[PDB]
């Protein structure tokens, strides 16, 4: 196959108590910025948020897989909202497994996926999987342009593992929000509106919809004349 309606970067990072993840609300269609109400952050329970870029139809598929997973985890499970609720690490292994089986049948799910969440024991979970089955974990994870522009900025806050306990939700969220602006400056397939999620071992799942890039700097554009010799 070959992708059609698509969504761009998904960026994320770990901090002292949880993880943050964000992605803009756009479904592009080739170069037509066709759909604008598109949520690409899928919460699963109260402790996992799965962010998805790639083919939007396959994303709509992966969503229903996740709703089905929740529904069935409940079957004959009197602890499905406690000791036996779905863990982020379970939800990632499932998706990772599906992704690689699908590559291997030569019929991929045309996606990159980031699973962010908090484990039952408090540990932060943050791992990536894509249409080829490749998986990796780092203190920062991004897809699409975000790997090229977001990662260099976020890696400057949490460069090493030891930086994670030094980073606070406030620092981290600001990094994330600044990155979304960089991506809006320089990614021709991005949108000003975006969604952002925080998963904290203490405050739980905060899911912020309908953000906008603010505080852009454009004023210097008035002083840009021509392309070399032109003076006016």
């Amino acid at each position: 196959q070959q992708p059609i309606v698509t969504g761009t970067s998904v960026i994320s990072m770990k901090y002292d108590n949880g993880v943050i993840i964000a992605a803009d609300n756009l479904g592009s269609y080739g170069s037509l910025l066709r759909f604008n109400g598109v949520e690409r952050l899928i919460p699963v329970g109260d402790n996992t948020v799965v962010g998805i870029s790639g083919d939007i139809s396959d994303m709509q598929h992966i969503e229903r897989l996740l709703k089905d997973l929740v529904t069935e985890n409940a079957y004959d499970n009197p602890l499905a909202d406690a000791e036996e609720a779905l863990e982020p690490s379970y939800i990632f292994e499932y998706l990772a497994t599906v992704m690689y089986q699908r590559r291997s049948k030569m019929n991929p799910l045309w996606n990159a996926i980031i699973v962010a969440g908090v484990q039952s024991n408090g540990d932060q979970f943050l791992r990536y999987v894509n249409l080829l089955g490749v998986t990796y974990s780092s203190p920062t994870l991004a897809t699409g342009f975000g790997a090229h522009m977001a990662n260099p900025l976020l890696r400057k806050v949490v460069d090493r593992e030891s930086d994670i306990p030094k980073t606070t939700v406030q620092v981290a969220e600001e990094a994330i929000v600044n990155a979304m602006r960089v991506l809006y400056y320089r990614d021709a397939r991005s949108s000003r509106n975006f969604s952002l999620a925080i998963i904290d071992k203490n405050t739980g799942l905060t899911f912020k919809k309908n953000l906008q890039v603010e505080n852009m700097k454009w004023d210097f554009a008035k002083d840009i004349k021509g392309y070399g010799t032109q003076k006016i």
Partner: protein, 140 residues
């Protein structure tokens, strides 16, 4: 003649399917279980005989869920009940996958009914040894 109650899909000369009626006997020997319909829902309740103080209390659950809106309880051969419920879960998934809306309660009844009726059609299977009470809230 005689003989009409040893295979399943067999009509007796007075028009009955004795093997189904014998299945009811297993149901009747089961625990008592009920359903009450109210102004905006349903309640299900069941009796769990404490065979022995050795059973962990609260811990041999009998009421099963189907999808997120349907409750099922049954009397008789418990393992048959789980089977029927499993089928119900599949049948509720198929319906939602194609139609998106979660399966309406009467539509679910006929899914179960049609399947259970199916096991009175052939002498290569026996009838379900459970009577089942189930229900839920749907678009109306």
């Amino acid at each position: 003649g005689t003989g009409y109650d040893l295979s399943n899909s067999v009509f007796s000369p007075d028009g009955r399917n004795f093997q189904v009626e014998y299945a009811v006997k297993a149901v009747e020997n089961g625990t008592t279980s009920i359903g009450i319909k109210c102004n905006d829902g349903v309640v299900f309740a069941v009796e769990k005989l404490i065979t022995s103080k050795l059973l962990v209390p609260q811990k041999n659950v009998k009421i099963q869920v189907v999808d997120r809106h349907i409750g099922c309880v049954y009397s008789g051969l418990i393992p048959d009940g789980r089977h029927l419920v499993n089928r119900g879960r599949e049948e509720a998934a198929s319906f939602k996958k194609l139609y998106k809306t979660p399966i309406p309660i009467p539509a679910f009844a006929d899914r179960l009914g049609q399947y259970v009726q199916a096991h009175t059609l052939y002498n290569s299977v026996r009838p379900f040894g459970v009577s089942t009470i189930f229900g839920g809230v749907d678009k109306n």
